[PDB]
Design a protein around this ligand. Structure first.
Ligand SMILES: COc1ccc2c(c1)cc(C(=O)NS(=O)(=O)c1cc3ccccc3o1)n2CC(=O)O
Ligand SMILES: COc1ccc2c(c1)cc(C(=O)NS(=O)(=O)c1cc3ccccc3o1)n2CC(=O)O
Ligand SMILES: COc1ccc2c(c1)cc(C(=O)NS(=O)(=O)c1cc3ccccc3o1)n2CC(=O)O
Lengths: 288, 275
């Protein structure tokens, strides 16, 4: 067991180190909370941390790992924002006691070998054009879960499809962890928090409010039915300068092979220049 | 409340939740949880797995019996009770797959070789169910026979690749008196086939001893023995390193054979040391 100093930010790179500390803590009665991140931390991540902090007797582990296995692509991996110094500063500010910052070598010493094969959900929406993306996500999340063995793991609702898939991973592999989804933190105008927001110029930043505007308009239009909700969202996206919509789709909450009932999720993906933005919202139809 | 558990008796659970709760309760009291996964119809090979598991001080032994779709009940339990096994886990297909087939394990490239030739997807099924069983039971050690060697290596790859906190224990293959590897298929062999089937183990043992003369001597010895058997259609005879990569010029390896006799496929494998 490596050194662990309570009340301070302890940073471990070796999977075996955090595993050992985690297990030692769990045996002393502490409940281990995991917030898995790819770094470049914003207020949305801090909301995950805070949710974890508030579980009584918790110790919070924040993982930071830019997982090469979930990138296509050529350049996407290299282009991903990396701001390590700010990240750890934020964790210290928030009173986090463990950051887990493994190397690529430690996570993938044998390269890609055994992997998670997601269900059919991974071939839709975000996964349509990116066929191995969610296999990459689920493989890393499985590994982080096995390494840290948390009682609860925290994810934002912003990447809703990812969240659903992770719930599938946990159910389908009988993992002994509770998955906690945390509502999307937004800028004051309603823009969903995102690492990618930094890539919007002032004009694109202005236009980008249209995603959240469209979703919230649809959620209130929805007393008038599905068609009205979708048409309200489409109108708002269409009014916005330089927003190219990739999909706007209304699905059941599990996004699964079932028709929408009264309760749904409306999901949007759109491009502003080269920046691709996602957002989603709970929809009640007829309210209902 | 924890499901009822009576120490020193055979406790049978069909609900994954029940065995999970009891195993956790047991671990917290100090017991080391040992898992022996099976598809039932228990034979001496399985009892060797059980006996290995029981040897660990402070062990509680969990034997799962589950016929995986993706890859005698009363006698089975009698045998386990006779061995002093305290937990049998006997789930339904529905309990194991309540949402059907969805998230699964994708084996690495090794699954496409050797047995993955006649059965490209077999190992995906095995690895998925083994992972589920490990997660439900959370054993300290899990026990497999060495007879399905490729399977065993893929399991160890699963454990490595997904950072599982279980120790994988390979137990030497139990064999009939003439050396035939124990298998549920052996009973279907007519007497001519049962006689010929001894060629698999005989070829592999001859090879292991021929190996002082080198790799080619060992392989040629094996082949000559197989060539002396009628009605034995050899699918492969392959010498590999112990992880089933290419055999190094010298050192430890494994020699693997598969053959068809009439309609039954037989496999065997053996440790080989080169030179
Ligand atoms: C509570 O409000 C919000 C709002 C938006 C949020 C978040 C919280 C969190 C993210 C986010 O992405 N985090 S992540 O990239 O570090 C990540 C890494 C990772 C690794 C494994 C599994 C899941 C994983 O998620 N985001 C949106 C964003 O950044 O675009
Ligand atoms: C529908 O169009 C396509 C196009 C290419 C595709 C697929 C579908 C499916 C795969 C695929 O499953 N490859 S894999 O099993 O070796 C794998 C690679 C990988 C990478 C990161 C994470 C997990 C991973 O699992 N591939 C890539 C391929 O065949 O090479
Ligand atoms: C120590 O000496 C031996 C010798 C031969 C042996 C074994 C032990 C065990 C088996 C065997 O296969 N058992 S199994 O069918 O119940 C099985 C359960 C299971 C669970 C998960 C994955 C694969 C699985 O396969 N066999 C060979 C046999 O019976 O054919």
């Amino acid at each position: 067991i490596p050194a662990f100093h309570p009340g301070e930010l302890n940073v471990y790179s070796a999977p075996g180190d955090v595993a050992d500390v985690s297990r030692a803590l769990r045996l002393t009665g502490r409940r281990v909370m995991l917030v898995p991140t790819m770094g470049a931390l914003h207020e949305g991540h801090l909301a995950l941390v805070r949710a974890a902090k508030r579980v009584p007797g918790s110790v919070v582990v924040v993982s930071i790992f830019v997982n090469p296995m979930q990138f296509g692509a050529g350049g996407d991996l290299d282009a991903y924002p990396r701001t390590p110094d700010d990240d750890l500063a934020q964790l210290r500010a928030e009173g986090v006691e463990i950051a887990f910052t493994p190397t690529t070598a430690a996570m993938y010493p044998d390269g890609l070998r055994t992997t998670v094969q997601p269900g059919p959900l991974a071939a839709e929406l975000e996964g349509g054009p990116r066929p191995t993306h969610f296999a990459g996500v689920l493989t890393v999340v499985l590994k982080l879960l096995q390494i840290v063995r948390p009682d609860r793991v925290f994810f934002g609702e912003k990447d809703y499809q990812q969240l659903v898939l992770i719930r599938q991973l946990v159910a389908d592999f009988n993992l002994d962890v509770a998955v906690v989804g945390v509502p999307t933190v937004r800028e004051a105008d309603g823009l969903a928090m995102s690492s990618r927001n930094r890539y919007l110029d002032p004009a694109q930043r202005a236009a980008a409010v249209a995603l959240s505007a469209a979703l919230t308009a649809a959620a209130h239009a929805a007393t008038a039915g599905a068609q009205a909700a979708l048409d309200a969202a489409r109108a708002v996206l269409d009014a916005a300068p330089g927003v190219a919509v990739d999909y706007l789709e209304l699905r059941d909450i599990g996004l699964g092979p079932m028709p929408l009932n009264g309760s749904g999720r409306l999901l949007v993906a759109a491009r502003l220049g080269t920046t691709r933005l996602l957002d989603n919202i709970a929809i009640e139809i007829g309210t209902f």
